Write a protein that binds this ligand. Structure first.
Ligand SMILES: CCC1=C(C)/C(=C/C2=NC(=C\c3[nH]c(/C=C4\NC(=O)[C@H](C)[C@H]4CC)c(C)c3CCC(=O)O)/C(CCC(=O)O)=C2C)NC1=O
Ligand SMILES: CCC1=C(C)/C(=C/C2=NC(=C\c3[nH]c(/C=C4\NC(=O)[C@H](C)[C@H]4CC)c(C)c3CCC(=O)O)/C(CCC(=O)O)=C2C)NC1=O
Ligand SMILES: CCC1=C(C)/C(=C/C2=NC(=C\c3[nH]c(/C=C4\NC(=O)[C@H](C)[C@H]4CC)c(C)c3CCC(=O)O)/C(CCC(=O)O)=C2C)NC1=O
Ligand SMILES: CCC1=C(C)/C(=C/C2=NC(=C\c3[nH]c(/C=C4\NC(=O)[C@H](C)[C@H]4CC)c(C)c3CCC(=O)O)/C(CCC(=O)O)=C2C)NC1=O
Ligand SMILES: CCC1=C(C)/C(=C/C2=NC(=C\c3[nH]c(/C=C4\NC(=O)[C@H](C)[C@H]4CC)c(C)c3CCC(=O)O)/C(CCC(=O)O)=C2C)NC1=O
Ligand SMILES: CCC1=C(C)/C(=C/C2=NC(=C\c3[nH]c(/C=C4\NC(=O)[C@H](C)[C@H]4CC)c(C)c3CCC(=O)O)/C(CCC(=O)O)=C2C)NC1=O
Ligand SMILES: CCC1=C(C)/C(=C/C2=NC(=C\c3[nH]c(/C=C4\NC(=O)[C@H](C)[C@H]4CC)c(C)c3CCC(=O)O)/C(CCC(=O)O)=C2C)NC1=O
Ligand SMILES: CCC1=C(C)/C(=C/C2=NC(=C\c3[nH]c(/C=C4\NC(=O)[C@H](C)[C@H]4CC)c(C)c3CCC(=O)O)/C(CCC(=O)O)=C2C)NC1=O
Ligand SMILES: CCC1=C(C)/C(=C/C2=NC(=C\c3[nH]c(/C=C4\NC(=O)[C@H](C)[C@H]4CC)c(C)c3CCC(=O)O)/C(CCC(=O)O)=C2C)NC1=O
Ligand SMILES: CCC1=C(C)/C(=C\C2=NC(=C\c3[nH]c(/C=C4\NC(=O)[C@H](C)[C@H]4CC)c(C)c3CCC(=O)O)/C(CCC(=O)O)=C2C)NC1=O
Lengths: 50, 69, 49, 162, 172, 172, 162, 162, 172, 162, 172
């Protein structure tokens, strides 16, 4: 999906600036959204079209 | 995982007692389903948020083992 | 079709469960390196073994 | 089950901080409106037979064909389990009223409603008219705010059926 | 997850009858002093950081062998995890304080807290003692009737003592 | 997941030799009987909803505690899952019937199903009886000589019966 | 491994749905094509030794320097290894013919072929021209649609090498 | 911990490939001036008592309010704790020196410093001033390259605190 | 993932006392022979494909059952997996050598590796023989004096032999 | 390109932090390691054409059949463009020497090498042993410290080709 | 990402030729004098809080209408973002100073910053003024002679000034 609003950019920029690239990436993959949409065993796909 | 504290990872044996399937009945199975018992291996740097997410979901863990020593 | 994105919606969902033999693995790797890296070429050296 | 206070603990445990003013406030409001919910549940607990039989006869009179032979409304055991189903809906509405949350409803009826109605060929129209009749009798039996809180869980059950 | 209302509904459903008048009377009482228990909750949440700091001070007061180099709380990340664990234990007990039911605590991390401590090698007895001293600090904070209108609230203190007791028993 | 032709292929690789004419004749026989096999699997898939509704009716007639509160199927979503799992096992049995190999079902799921149904506390013999009733209702539909050119299919009925028997026994 | 039936079952199970008309269609096509592939693989099995000997002679005539001392093809041991590799390729072609899919060929030869050929510095062109020789000999050893299917499988192996 | 060898090995293992020129050059750059680091650690491990008492007294001087009763600085056990704290910091600076990296310094002082400091009500400027005095006197106890390594590591600790 | 410096710091912090004179002197020595260590690991890296190829040739020659059909390295896929495991083992050996500490090898390369082969049916004895032949070839490529300045490195050869041998023992 | 300086900056960048001691340590190692590398580059550049001629004739001497009619080395274009390819490899080895990292090799040659060698049937062995000839010739072309660097990069190119 | 060496290399490759003698001389001089560069980068890294704080003090003591309500640095979130941007720009200037090339700056901090600041309404003139103030505070720190050997570094002063001016001119 694309970003929904500017607060996402602010939060992720601060997360990076404070914790590094590894934490920045973990915030995406360990997020509840990835786990509910794709879970452990599904390859990510462009789901924002629907 | 460069520093020593990053390593010494742990392995968690997780059971799927119905307390999470009862909520997912309402949330929905919009991904293919899997069996009940499965084991995950998590590094120390995110052990706590890992099992915290599992319990937010509602997972029941039978045993937790230390992978390194 | 009015969007550019029909090929991406019609594309089937690809999953990889633990007991796989050989070829769905070789297809899932292609799908992953196609999506994650954003349809950028990943030369054989760059691919992690 | 996801009751109001259960929502409080759930939406708290996800993140770091404790239960702030908002969660205490929501639990507070639930704790006031619980006692009227308790007396409304009691008032609804006295009239099982009247409610169930009135609803049964209402849904039968709206649908004359199910009674007629060759249809699934025909039968002694069929009508007995009609009564048992309506009693189930009544007791789960009672549970929701007691808990001040739609937790028991979502847990015990709404979860998997569609698939089972699919496989056993049940029609939601029968149960929806039964719930409308129960709405009608709650209109007379209950008055004021108790009536409102009862009707809200009831028409939540309607919204679930539809 | 199950609260006291959810637990009562669980019994009433598994039996197959409705809630008996006794159940409604009990739950009406519970809703009546819900205000008192929410005041207990507010005291616990607002006084939580002071409880944690005093708890850590006195805990290091009884046993010093955690502070010495190589100690169970020496590394300043392992005592950091110590403090975070005390904080989350207090938060979980507050959750149980709202729920009025022991189920929400046991279901939430008390199944595998034992085993994570065992594999990690954390001394469970020290965790338990931290629990009792936290309970004492929290009780002292809930005695204070300043800013909150007075009343009879022994039941909440007993319930919180039982909560901290089950937490200690599951840990150690 | 594997079919009979690939079983012959795999055992031929293991012994290191080319496929023998005896097994090749067996495979030719299977390939010509595959016309009847396709109709068998098509009947299964076609009648799956009727078969599952029928077996659900017979099961809920013979076994009643799944209705009463405290029974496994009493909560509404739980017996929704009952129907869903019946459908899943029928789908896997259709897979096995098309393939001619029983492992595509067994090795796929029965390993975890045993421990799952042990932990969940469900009456697993009830699930085995569900498989048996599924087999009977599918057997009723597979003998439908209407809509299909009449032929010899006793071996296909035996294959389906044995597949369901093994599925239930692994459940049991 | 992988046949038409196996791919049928895999695709049907991946979407979590029953076995509908399209994959029944693929299964029926493969089932009808079964017998000619059976006869083709049988004919190939009748000619193991002739095919492998001819293939190694072809690689020697097209790669004469290989035979000289100090090369890979010097020594009777490497001669027997020539025969063994060609026999393995032929055997997996016959396995693919019987299975009516590239499955056995894929997971026995193609799976990890580049890495192994790079490790022991084998040349893919050796096996490519040897498979072209097997193509040339099966162009006469065989007849019918058996030609088209056998040649398709040999060409698939070649394309995997190339 | 995290020493130059540690990042070299971690980065090399991340790509799953052997250590190329760059990693060996980094290891060589660490190795060749391991000696100013070790001699600096030796020079400031003999003077640890002078270092700790000087830092504690300088902290007392710079902040008069942390001396009189009614605060944490006052107290015999509290001043023993202050001396133990300064000894711990200096020992971890020595560990950073011998490691030729910030690793031991990182995962002993810097990691989890803010909240540990905060939950016990300790001013960061206290330890910042102590390390500033350690900087001041290690500027003279060490000369040249060893002085450079000291200054850099103690200031990295300061920047972590500040 | 520890080196000699990090490990020694770990024991020094376990004691709680500063680092001594003698240990710091031997660490300075370790730094001085660090250049010979870097040339040792360079000799290991430079010739990795050759070492893998020769060790594989010798191993497959000594155990023909690995190559023959039904063996554990028969298909191209399994041969590639074998060679990749050999290269990974050598890579972690070089990692440990440059770190000067066996921690790099044992902490990530050997944890679940011992039992994965057993669960796979892989004979770990063959893996031990493989890494032994790898050790022989690595010694041969290490004693080479071409293109480098000559000196004493016997401790380096002993350390590399210990690393290879304990990798063999831990796998086996 | 991946060098010591760039890898340092990218590592301190992805972590969102300034450059601490270890990073400047590696940078200094690079800066003083530069001079032998720069001299090696000057020597290889001065002796470029002789090295290319030597490597070409080494390819032809070791692979005598390649120049025979009908295959790759036959004809003037393929020899002139063999010289071109060896010139490319030599140029990128010197580039990697000057940058003191395997950036230029891993970018302009190593990345995408197997695909283009496969698609043109260029045997890697030709290049592996031409690089072996250059590896030898630097023994009597360079000596001392820079010889290790030049050998290291010739070596990385040979390993990537194999 | 680039540095001076890779820039010269890229120019030479795009042209297709080895590096000429003069360019090798330039890179050799750069590497020879890079120790002063390391000292400058350390001066930026070690004093960075001082630069940021002095620049913030001056900026908000001359441009009051930022910290006023409705000013675009009013709440703590906007002031914190201001200081964070200042630190990030200083960070990428120290990076580009170590590298000797401003490509990392122009690719990670400056390629979309004017547009972002316009889309957020932040006055890019004030951001450039903040950058110039940081430049002044830093030059007070790069000319420090304490703890370093005496020497001339006018070249590094000019280079750092041009990096700060690049940031200013690509934000303003
Ligand atoms: C957890 C709570 C719960 C619900 C909600 C529920 C609905 C339900 N009703 C059923 C039977 C039935 N229910 C009805 C009643 C309907 N059909 C008539 O037209 C009436 C107008 C109408 C009554 C309002 C009938 C006729 C059947 C017969 C189908 C059968 O043979 O099972 C069945 C099939 C299994 C059984 O009960 O024996 C289900 C699942 N079951 C539950 O355990
Ligand atoms: C929004 C969250 C929330 C707040 C802020 C809150 C405070 C609160 N406490 C109240 C009564 C009370 N408050 C307490 C508090 C106790 N008295 C003892 O001294 C204990 C130390 C202490 C803690 C248990 C008691 C006993 C009552 C009287 C309960 C009753 O009406 O019987 C009331 C009602 C006052 C009235 O009826 O005129 C409020 C608003 N309650 C809440 O649900
Ligand atoms: C796709 C392959 C697959 C299968 C086969 C499978 C079986 C299965 N059925 C489950 C729930 C269930 N399954 C049943 C069905 C049984 N109970 C009795 O009433 C009947 C005799 C019988 C019907 C056949 C019930 C009642 C539950 C509810 C238990 C619970 O939610 O706690 C669960 C627990 C979590 C879940 O999947 O929802 C599993 C793992 N799971 C799978 O992923
Ligand atoms: C569109 C999907 C598709 C299907 C379904 C399919 C099966 C299929 N079944 C056929 C006939 C047949 N069908 C059957 C099976 C039936 N005979 C009865 O006795 C059994 C009760 C029953 C088994 C379920 C048999 C036995 C034949 C004749 C084949 C023979 O000689 O044995 C035929 C040939 C038509 C003919 O003989 O005139 C086909 C193609 N092929 C397809 O491409
Ligand atoms: C799945 C089936 C399978 C195949 C096909 C296969 C190919 C294969 N052939 C081999 C031996 C060999 N095979 C050849 C033959 C080649 N050189 C010339 O004679 C000819 C031009 C050409 C053959 C026509 C040679 C020279 C070797 C020895 C390679 C070496 O040891 O360096 C080896 C190495 C075994 C060893 O000695 O350790 C493999 C892996 N392996 C398999 O498991
Ligand atoms: C090796 C890792 C480590 C660090 C970093 C460390 C600092 C530290 N010092 C502490 C106690 C203390 N530290 C001080 C010293 C401060 N207050 C004033 O006296 C001074 C101006 C100032 C020192 C410059 C004091 C007064 C205490 C008393 C308890 C408290 O305030 O929490 C505590 C609380 C727990 C304890 O150790 O008793 C920590 C975490 N301790 C460690 O084990
Ligand atoms: C940038 C990466 C790097 C390289 C390229 C490197 C090679 C290297 N080898 C060296 C000396 C040496 N190297 C060795 C080790 C060798 N001597 C024996 O032949 C052994 C078989 C063999 C061990 C594998 C010895 C004994 C010396 C001389 C003693 C000394 O280092 O002081 C030196 C220092 C003095 C000099 O030769 O000019 C370097 C830089 N070291 C590095 O850190
Ligand atoms: C970035 C650096 C770079 C490299 C390394 C490179 C290699 C390279 N060599 C090529 C052709 C070639 N290269 C050779 C090399 C052979 N010639 C002699 O016979 C020897 C035996 C042997 C050299 C040692 C030959 C024969 C061809 C022509 C083959 C063909 O046209 O298919 C081609 C195809 C494009 C063309 O030249 O027409 C590439 C891409 N290209 C690059 O841009
Ligand atoms: C671990 C990171 C690291 C640091 C911190 C470091 C500093 C460092 N600065 C040095 C010299 C120097 N340092 C400076 C810089 C100062 N002189 C100028 O006047 C200004 C006051 C100021 C810079 C603006 C100069 C000019 C030299 C002498 C230049 C030379 O070495 O040829 C030297 C070599 C000793 C000498 O030749 O005197 C080192 C090692 N090296 C490192 O590897
Ligand atoms: C989500 C709820 C939950 C928690 C918090 C829990 C305990 C817990 N404590 C941990 C670390 C720790 N926890 C403690 C605390 C104990 N040791 C002593 O200091 C004290 C007496 C006592 C404090 C109460 C310590 C010391 C560690 C450090 C382990 C180590 O780094 O080796 C970890 C590893 C995750 C991490 O720190 O990143 C867990 C999961 N178990 C749970 O199910």
């Amino acid at each position: 999906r694309a970003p929904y609003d500017q607060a996402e950019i602010s939060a992720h920029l601060d997360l990076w600036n404070t914790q590094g690239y590894d934490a920045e990436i973990d915030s995406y993959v360990e997020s509840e959204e990835y786990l509910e949409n794709f879970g452990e065993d599904v390859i990510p796909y462009f789901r924002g079209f629907k | 995982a460069i520093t020593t504290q990053g390593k010494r990872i742990y392995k968690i044996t997780v059971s799927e007692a119905g307390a999470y399937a009862t909520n997912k009945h309402r949330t929905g199975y919009r991904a293919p389903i899997r069996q009940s018992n499965y084991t995950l291996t998590v590094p120390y740097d995110r052990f706590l948020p890992e099992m915290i997410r599992l319990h937010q979901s509602g997972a029941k863990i039978v045993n937790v083992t230390s992978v390194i020593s | 079709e009015r969007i550019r994105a029909l090929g991406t919606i019609e594309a089937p969902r690809v999953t990889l469960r633990a007991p796989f033999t050989d070829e769905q693995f070789q297809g899932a790797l292609y799908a992953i390196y196609r999506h994650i890296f954003g349809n950028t070429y990943v030369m054989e050296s760059e691919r992690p073994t | 089950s996801r009751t109001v206070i259960t929502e409080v603990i759930a939406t708290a445990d996800s993140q770091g901080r404790f239960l702030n003013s908002t969660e205490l406030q929501a639990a507070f409001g639930r704790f006031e409106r619980a006692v009227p919910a308790i007396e409304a549940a009691r008032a609804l607990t006295k009239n099982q037979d009247a409610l169930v039989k009135g609803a049964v006869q209402a849904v039968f009179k709206k649908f004359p064909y199910v009674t007629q032979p060759g249809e699934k409304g025909y039968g002694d055991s069929n009508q007995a389990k009609c009564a048992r189903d309506i009693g189930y809906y009544l007791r789960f509405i009672t549970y929701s009223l007691v808990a001040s949350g739609t937790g028991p409803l979502d847990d015990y009826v709404i979860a998997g409603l569609r698939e089972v109605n699919r496989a056993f060929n049940l029609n939601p129209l029968w149960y929806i008219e039964a719930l409308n009749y129960i709405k009608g009798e709650t209109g007379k039996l209950l008055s004021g705010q108790s009536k409102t809180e009862a009707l809200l869980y009831i028409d939540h059950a309607i919204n679930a059926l539809s | 997850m199950n609260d006291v209302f959810t637990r009562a509904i669980a019994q009433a459903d598994l039996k197959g009858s409705f809630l008996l008048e006794s159940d409604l009377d009990k739950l009406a009482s519970f809703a009546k002093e819900g205000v008192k228990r929410l005041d207990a909750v507010a005291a616990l949440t607002n006084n939580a950081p002071a409880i944690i700091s005093d708890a850590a001070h006195k805990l290091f007061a009884e046993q010093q062998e955690l502070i010495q180099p190589g100690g169970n709380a020496y590394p300043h990340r392992r005592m950091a995890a110590c403090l975070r664990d005390m904080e989350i234990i207090l938060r979980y007990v507050s959750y149980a304080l709202l729920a009025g039911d022991a189920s929400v605590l046991d279901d939430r991390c008390l199944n595998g807290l034992r085993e994570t401590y065992n594999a990690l090698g954390t001394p469970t007895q020290s965790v338990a003692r931290a629990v009792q001293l936290m309970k004492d600090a929290a009780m002292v904070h809930l005695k204070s009737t300043a800013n909150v209108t007075v009343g009879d609230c022994s039941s909440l203190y007993s319930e919180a003592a039982t909560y901290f007791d089950k937490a200690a028993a599951s840990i150690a």
